[PDB]
Design an enzyme around this catalytic site. Structure first.
Site, short mmCIF file in Angstrom:
data_model
loop_
_atom_site.label_atom_id
_atom_site.label_comp_id
_atom_site.label_asym_id
_atom_site.label_seq_id
_atom_site.Cartn_x
_atom_site.Cartn_y
_atom_site.Cartn_z
N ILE D 12 0.85 -1.00 -0.08
CA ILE D 12 -0.06 0.07 0.13
C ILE D 12 0.97 1.24 -0.05
O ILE D 12 0.94 1.99 -0.97
CB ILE D 12 -0.93 0.19 1.15
N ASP D 37 11.14 2.66 6.86
CA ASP D 37 10.89 1.08 6.99
C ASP D 37 12.10 0.56 7.39
O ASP D 37 12.82 1.18 8.01
CB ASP D 37 10.50 0.38 5.44
N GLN D 90 11.15 2.88 13.59
CA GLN D 90 11.07 2.76 15.08
C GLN D 90 9.83 1.98 15.47
O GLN D 90 9.08 2.06 14.87
CB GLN D 90 11.02 4.35 15.27
N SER D 164 -11.56 0.03 5.38
CA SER D 164 -10.84 -0.97 4.66
C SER D 164 -10.88 -1.03 3.27
O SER D 164 -11.56 -0.22 2.60
CB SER D 164 -11.42 -2.24 5.34
N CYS D 165 -10.35 -2.17 2.53
CA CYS D 165 -10.49 -2.09 1.18
C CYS D 165 -12.03 -2.63 0.73
O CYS D 165 -12.72 -2.25 0.02
CB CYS D 165 -9.48 -2.96 0.50
N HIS D 193 -11.81 -13.39 -1.84
CA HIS D 193 -10.69 -12.63 -1.71
C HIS D 193 -9.52 -13.08 -2.05
O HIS D 193 -9.21 -14.14 -1.89
CB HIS D 193 -10.51 -11.81 -0.23
N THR D 196 -3.18 -12.15 0.89
CA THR D 196 -2.28 -11.17 1.07
C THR D 196 -1.07 -11.62 1.81
O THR D 196 -0.68 -12.61 1.97
CB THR D 196 -3.19 -10.23 1.87
N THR D 225 -14.92 -10.96 8.46
CA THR D 225 -14.82 -9.78 8.08
C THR D 225 -15.50 -8.49 9.00
O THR D 225 -16.47 -9.05 9.54
CB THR D 225 -15.53 -9.75 6.62
N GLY D 226 -15.07 -7.26 8.91
CA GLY D 226 -15.71 -6.58 9.83
C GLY D 226 -16.40 -5.52 8.87
O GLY D 226 -17.01 -4.40 9.40
N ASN D 334 -8.01 -4.86 -4.80
CA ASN D 334 -7.61 -4.39 -3.44
C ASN D 334 -6.69 -3.26 -2.99
O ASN D 334 -6.84 -2.60 -1.93
CB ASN D 334 -7.82 -5.56 -2.40
N1 LIG Z 1 -2.79 -5.01 0.44
C1 LIG Z 1 -4.00 -4.82 0.60
O1 LIG Z 1 -4.97 -5.60 -0.19
C2 LIG Z 1 -4.93 -3.90 1.62
C3 LIG Z 1 -5.85 -3.28 1.33
C4 LIG Z 1 -6.30 -2.33 2.10
C5 LIG Z 1 -5.98 -2.08 3.52
N2 LIG Z 1 -4.65 -2.86 3.83
C6 LIG Z 1 -3.99 -2.60 5.12
O2 LIG Z 1 -2.64 -1.93 4.95
C7 LIG Z 1 -1.91 -2.36 5.97
C8 LIG Z 1 -0.56 -2.88 5.44
O3 LIG Z 1 -0.81 -3.84 4.53
P1 LIG Z 1 0.38 -4.36 3.75
O4 LIG Z 1 -0.20 -5.61 2.87
O5 LIG Z 1 0.53 -3.25 2.63
O6 LIG Z 1 1.67 -4.77 4.40
P2 LIG Z 1 2.98 -5.15 4.00
O7 LIG Z 1 2.60 -5.12 2.61
O8 LIG Z 1 2.76 -6.32 4.88
O9 LIG Z 1 3.38 -3.75 4.63
C9 LIG Z 1 3.83 -3.84 5.89
C10 LIG Z 1 5.10 -3.09 6.12
O10 LIG Z 1 5.39 -2.52 7.22
C11 LIG Z 1 6.81 -2.36 7.61
N3 LIG Z 1 7.06 -2.14 8.90
C12 LIG Z 1 7.03 -3.31 9.83
N4 LIG Z 1 7.20 -2.74 11.09
C13 LIG Z 1 7.54 -1.29 10.83
C14 LIG Z 1 7.88 -0.40 11.56
N5 LIG Z 1 8.11 -0.48 13.05
N6 LIG Z 1 8.07 0.97 11.08
C15 LIG Z 1 8.16 1.17 9.80
N7 LIG Z 1 7.83 -0.11 9.10
C16 LIG Z 1 7.43 -1.29 9.61
C17 LIG Z 1 7.41 -3.71 6.77
O11 LIG Z 1 8.62 -3.87 6.56
C18 LIG Z 1 6.36 -3.73 5.65
O12 LIG Z 1 7.16 -3.16 4.47
C19 LIG Z 1 -2.33 -3.28 6.71
O13 LIG Z 1 -2.82 -2.89 7.83
C20 LIG Z 1 -3.80 -3.59 6.05
O14 LIG Z 1 -4.95 -3.74 6.79
C21 LIG Z 1 -4.16 -3.71 2.82
#
Ligand SMILES: NC(=O)c1ccc[n+]([C@@H]2O[C@H](COP(=O)([O-])OP(=O)(O)OC[C@H]3O[C@@H](n4cnc5c(N)ncnc54)[C@H](O)[C@@H]3O)[C@@H](O)[C@H]2O)c1
Ligand SMILES: NC(=O)c1ccc[n+]([C@@H]2O[C@H](COP(=O)([O-])OP(=O)(O)OC[C@H]3O[C@@H](n4cnc5c(N)ncnc54)[C@H](O)[C@@H]3O)[C@@H](O)[C@H]2O)c1
Ligand SMILES: NC(=O)c1ccc[n+]([C@@H]2O[C@H](COP(=O)([O-])OP(=O)(O)OC[C@H]3O[C@@H](n4cnc5c(N)ncnc54)[C@H](O)[C@@H]3O)[C@@H](O)[C@H]2O)c1
Ligand SMILES: NC(=O)c1ccc[n+]([C@@H]2O[C@H](COP(=O)([O-])OP(=O)(O)OC[C@H]3O[C@@H](n4cnc5c(N)ncnc54)[C@H](O)[C@@H]3O)[C@@H](O)[C@H]2O)c1
Lengths: 358, 358, 358, 358
Positions: D12, D37, D90, D164-165, D193, D196, D225-226, D334
């Site tokens: 994202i 990151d 951090q 959410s998505c 779905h 992920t 799901t919520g 998504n």
């Molecule tokens: N990918 C989807 O389909 C989607 C859609 C809507 C919402 N989301 C939401 O977005 C959020 C992230 O999902 P994601 O799939 O992109 O996650 P990733 O693709 O799993 O992204 C997580 C990132 O967080 C980083 N990280 C972990 N700890 C950290 C820290 N302390 N400081 C800085 N960076 C840190 C990781 O290195 C990683 O790159 C989730 O909470 C999820 O609910 C995801």
């Protein structure tokens, strides 16, 4: 080449059309008259043309119409201005309206007329030259652009073959190995290969190849190849010094070559690596390519090279201080590049029947 | 081996427990006292033990309970009548209750103490012998069963290593090559490998192996290997003559070895074929096996051999009349067989500490 | 049922043969005389019978031979002692040697004679009773076991149909709903379905279902279904109150039903839950089952139930305090269970033609 | 919005950056100062930025450099002219150089600071406004653009959630159902779905969600799901009249909604269908979209709509003559669309803290 027909409209036949559109040539240089497949519903064809699971959306306007107004269902594709005729599939190519439609070069994509006399029916249908988009049998001449497409003789060669997709990737590698003078006293090759239109979704029937009927996306399936063999054809220097096998793994496009050979003189991988990279910028330009990034199969989709040398993979993975015993690694999108090479041969041949150069 | 402990209870640690059970050794011969992982909910363990997406349902009775009745949630596995203790994961192995639980041989399965001093912390927690179920570093002894397990010295080796899976598949191959007197003057190898628990589902973070981070079930991912390397450790005869790479393809289990080597004196694949099939029936029995049917990857699931020689694939695919230049193909279920060798090693080492011989 | 013939020997016809074997009925009760497919190489059949990419290796002895010794290639399967005849596929079933081989109940599995008159050609080849292992058309009788198999009339029905897989999963669900007196005033259903032998590996040709032709292991593909529809045939009570669709997702076997309905009088999911679990232990026993563990799709492989009720999924996911608006979730191994019902039907029909009762 | 920071740079966080580049806004309107990151190797970041398994190559120039010349490894991304600073991750956001770096709106993408007070540390690090890219807890305000992003109060809302998505896909559907006056007396929903970044490649450890740790690409996994719930939040009209569940199937991107609801007045599917299509061209423009072609999941990849109504799927699949009992089908990529909505909210809020409109 101007007047072109297409026999069998799927995947290659589709990617082949597409290349000559993408390379901007439809209706300035190449004139696709008609396509022919298992029907004539022009709008399925347009559906197939716009939306592709792997390569993406068509970047052009697709439209449909009827030749004459007593038709039932639209029968013409109208791509980016141009009208292409949908024609009805035939069990025997002799029954194609080739001469009447005004077609001179036709491109074979069914997969059912590999034997040279079979495909030769196109000539008898008033077609003038045939290019078989696969390895033909029965004394058809085989070309591999940038390795031996200069042997083409407008008077001699009438039904020709553009080889295989793997033959097209392997050939450019061996060529610069021989030409820059390292040599191949002998060689063996594997190809890790994407699954294709001839595999089954579930364990199916394949009575010639038992292993090939098994569930395509659930397996690694050892398989045979003629690719190496055919190289000897294109580079007669190398006859019976090469062979190989194929593994089919569950990925929908792109594939790679694993070549292990013994050289003719004492070298190092360092010197071969440098030779390759440089043929990229000179005589093998746009056929042979190279990379030194950390890429994976997804990253070559729609890559129009014939062969792409993975530099870090090779260097990372040979014995140190070695002098003769080497392996080489090289990628290729099996649909995309080969499809470009098909158009490349077609223009070359044309230009050469003094059908106007470029 | 009687008293056993297991460190890290997943995949390998799960397959390893299961092995000794199916091979009927739990509570007669081997005595799993405790297991340890990222918690102590014994019912999540039991859920984990009864249902598997690849190998199938557990053919045994699983049950949970609590050690002492002031606990909160069950903390003992009760498999087929036997009581194993769930024990709380520790950042540092010197903090395990080995001495106290009464555990003498411990199986390292976390993937976090490959370095010999690190894995020695178990001896420090009262543990007595430690097998690393993965290639160790820092002068830990490496064993390969049916190849060199006999160099084990009850006095000398206390932290040992059962190699890797690919090393356990390649090793027996090369063994009977050298022995029956064919020789390997120089060799190169590829393995087409199934994905593992360290890949990512989607494009991920892998700052050490950049290519490793990419979406796992969508790619062919070139990767390295120390497997050949480690072979010269196990058969010193061949040090600095071997190397190779891996390709990670979208399958969940089973993998294959593609060996290409140069012999020491003349032969034919016909004779190499035979020698391999004999070794199956004689000295390498139950370690190395062979097949001459048309099997695909899926057909090797839950096959407990170390290396399985594919005969048609081999014979079909070498050069005719060749003397020295040869290619061999061998299968292997990367989880299962290796989990059985691990048990095989523990027993051997045990009997050998005159911990009663079988 | 004693004398049996099988038309089309793949997947269903293979699963169906296997069923009666595992259920120990070959050569005591049922007597498979002959099978027929796109050839008569009995060893490709045996290869096909012994190795399966999903369900695993055949736990029985497979062997081949020739009927008479002027044949060319073995043409008889010899399973666990029994001799089945391989018989040559025919474009028209009236050309089968049914009368002659001495076959009385024949199992249609090709997918090519769904229309009642078409499938009647078997009676014409000397065959006597024909079960269509798929929804038939043209006034063939449809049966669902444990729902209405008792309407079978030895005098009336000669060409019959055992529904589809989804109809066999949904049907028992709705049954105990109507019976225990909950009612369905109106209902809608989705099934998330595994791909089948009629999808394509890569983007393909499907002029009837355009969406069906797309690359199968790369997509979610909405699709239709007659399954609910056919339910009103089997439980006339509910005609014109049901419908739904399918989604084809990239899994090789097993599927799930997501039913959403409106009750006839007030209740709670709590009571509906219970009624379903009871029916499992009483009148619908062995047809409908239930689970209250946290299982995923893979956990249902080779499960021979018609419909399996997922209790946590259901209870967790309905509205609180709801009276009439409800959702139910049920699993099913689309190959296996249905192949067992097919056998169940043949036996019933048999005993009923007073072909000796069990 | 001008001054922007990004917490957690993957998928994202990566797609969010990308959108605001693709929509031409970097360094005219939005100024990404730094990203942060699990490291600061600027060239991995550039590798991650150029090559994506699913969405394709970056269409822009990526480059690297060092802030100051005593650094060890480049620490700045130089995208299309602009310099973005890589900052070191951090454990607690309070320790972010937000105020110093000159950042005012920050975008949360780790997934570790959903609870409102946790994420509120950003404000305490000299950040000024926080947008949590997921469903927050503890009294953060939730917005769904084009449904209620006009409730935003520059004085009241400081840490907000963009939902959410799935909530973003479902919400726009229910909105026009309520607003055009058809209504929802009650509703139930499934979502098929894509898998992920929180699923495992092989059966893994998931002690809160047992079913979710199982082998991602080998299963259909019922899940919770919520999404529905949160709708009530955004449309308080609908509180506690809706709920649902999720199935996760082995596809790497794109997903779909299956909505079954009972209306408030007597209608037909025909009238709903027409309402939807028309909101597409009016008030819900560019949020809600629609299609009447025969498409599959592959065909919406990189589709920047929030919700795309599949017209033929719905019409094809409801009961005829029905008046209240309806289902609706709607697609959504998504990663892609939701990521656009994140930027959309950010600009809106800014403009509104009278941070200059557009
Ligand atoms: N990918 C989807 O389909 C989607 C859609 C809507 C919402 N989301 C939401 O977005 C959020 C992230 O999902 P994601 O799939 O992109 O996650 P990733 O693709 O799993 O992204 C997580 C990132 O967080 C980083 N990280 C972990 N700890 C950290 C820290 N302390 N400081 C800085 N960076 C840190 C990781 O290195 C990683 O790159 C989730 O909470 C999820 O609910 C995801
Ligand atoms: N896809 C690749 O990776 C690749 C690469 C190099 C070469 N090839 C070769 O191209 C050929 C086609 O492969 P493909 O994968 O594109 O096939 P498809 O993708 O399987 O193409 C075959 C087409 O032939 C049509 N057809 C069948 N009978 C016909 C007839 N009598 N008249 C007209 N059309 C007919 C079908 O309708 C179908 O569309 C093969 O022979 C193969 O050797 C394929
Ligand atoms: N299955 C194979 O392909 C294979 C074959 C041969 C060797 N191996 C090796 O075995 C090792 C394990 O691999 P794996 O596949 O089982 O990994 P998993 O399958 O990823 O196993 C890891 C387990 O260790 C647990 N764990 C982590 N830290 C722990 C700690 N401090 N204390 C206790 N438990 C802890 C985790 O919770 C997890 O359950 C690896 O080093 C690998 O190289 C794997
Ligand atoms: N496995 C399932 O999901 C499932 C469940 C219920 C019903 N069914 C139904 O059963 C039928 C079979 O499906 P299937 O999956 O087994 O197909 P396959 O799995 O595609 O079976 C087809 C077989 O029929 C053979 N065949 C074709 N024409 C023949 C002929 N003229 N004479 C003899 N054999 C011939 C083919 O060679 C092939 O072996 C279908 O109609 C399908 O609707 C399938």
């Amino acid at each position: 080449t101007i007047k072109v027909g297409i026999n069998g409209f799927g995947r290659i036949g589709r990617m082949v059309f597409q290349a000559l559109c993408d390379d901007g040539l439809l209706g300035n240089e190449i004139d696709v008259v008609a396509v022919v497949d298992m029907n004539t519903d022009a709008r399925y064809f347009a559906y197939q043309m716009k939306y592709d699971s792997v390569h993406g959306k068509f970047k052009h306007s697709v439209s449909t119409t009827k030749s004459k107004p007593s038709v039932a269902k639209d029968d013409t594709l109208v791509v980016n201005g141009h009208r292409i005729l949908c024609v009805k599939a035939q069990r025997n190519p002799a029954d194609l309206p080739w001469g009447k439609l005004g077609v001179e070069y036709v491109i074979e994509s069914t997969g059912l007329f590999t034997v040279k006399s079979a495909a030769e029916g196109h000539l008898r249908g008033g077609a003038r030259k045939v290019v078989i988009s696969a390895p033909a049998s029965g004394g058809a001449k085989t070309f591999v652009m940038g390795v031996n497409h200069n042997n083409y003789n407008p008077r001699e060669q009438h039904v020709v073959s553009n080889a295989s997709c793997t033959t097209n990737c392997l050939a450019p590698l061996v060529h610069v190995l021989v030409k820059e003078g390292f040599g191949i006293s002998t060689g063996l090759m594997t190809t890790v290969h994407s699954y294709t239109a001839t595999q089954k979704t579930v364990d199916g029937v394949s009575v010639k190849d038992w292993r090939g009927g098994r569930a395509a996306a659930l397996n690694i399936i050892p398989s045979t190849t003629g690719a190496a063999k055919a190289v000897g054809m294109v580079i007669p220097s190398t006859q019976g010094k090469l062979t190989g096998m194929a593994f089919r793994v569950p990925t929908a496009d792109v594939s790679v070559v694993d070549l292990t050979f013994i050289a003719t003189r004492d070298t190092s991988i360092k010197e071969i690596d440098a030779a390759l990279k440089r043929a990229s910028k000179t005589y093998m330009k746009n056929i042979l390519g190279y990379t030194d990034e950390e890429l994976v199969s997804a990253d070559f989709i729609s890559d129009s090279r014939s062969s792409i040398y993975d530099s870090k993979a090779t260097l990372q993975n040979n014995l140190p201080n070695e002098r003769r015993f080497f392996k080489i690694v090289s990628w290729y999108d099996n649909e995309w590049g080969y499809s470009h090479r098909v158009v490349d041969l077609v223009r070359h041949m044309a230009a050469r029947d003094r059908a106007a150069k470029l």
